[PDB]
């Protein structure tokens, strides 16, 4: 039902929208125990993660976590500009909730 990313981001607690508008500077992927995650950063100095699947995630989000990590790798490789990010700010780095790309 949400029509855009800012509308979707507002349905949640502890989320912020960041207008990035630039390509990812670095991509880091880990398969180490309890650290199965992906970290990305930008020229601006901003760092974001995709949380390790855990107890705070419903079964529906499981497949969605994999898709997000897949999207970050391809976006990185193709040098695609990310438009905005919706992130949970109660995590460090801030956890990604939704991405948006434009043009």
């Amino acid at each position: 039902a949400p029509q855009t990313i800012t509308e979707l981001c507002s349905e949640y607690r502890n989320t912020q929208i960041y207008t990035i508008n630039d390509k990812i500077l670095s991509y880091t992927e880990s398969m180490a125990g309890k650290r199965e995650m992906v970290i990305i950063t930008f020229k601006s100095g901003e760092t974001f993660q995709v949380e390790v699947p855990g107890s705070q995630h419903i079964d529906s989000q499981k497949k969605a976590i994999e898709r997000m990590k897949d999207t970050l790798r391809i976006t990185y490789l193709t040098e695609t500009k990310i438009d905005k990010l919706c992130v949970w700010n109660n995590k460090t780095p801030n956890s990604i909730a939704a991405i948006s790309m434009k043009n």
């Binding site: 497949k63 994999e66 897949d70 391809i74 490789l77 193709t78």
Partner: protein
Amino acid sequence: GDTCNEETQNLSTIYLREYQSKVKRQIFSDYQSEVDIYNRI
């Protein structure tokens, strides 16, 4: 004939096909979609 020039022709095509593969490795990789093998199997 197939002396000096059959060579240049075959050598030039060789260099080209090599390059063309470098190009496909760039533009065709954008279409590669990864599969969840544990969901497939």
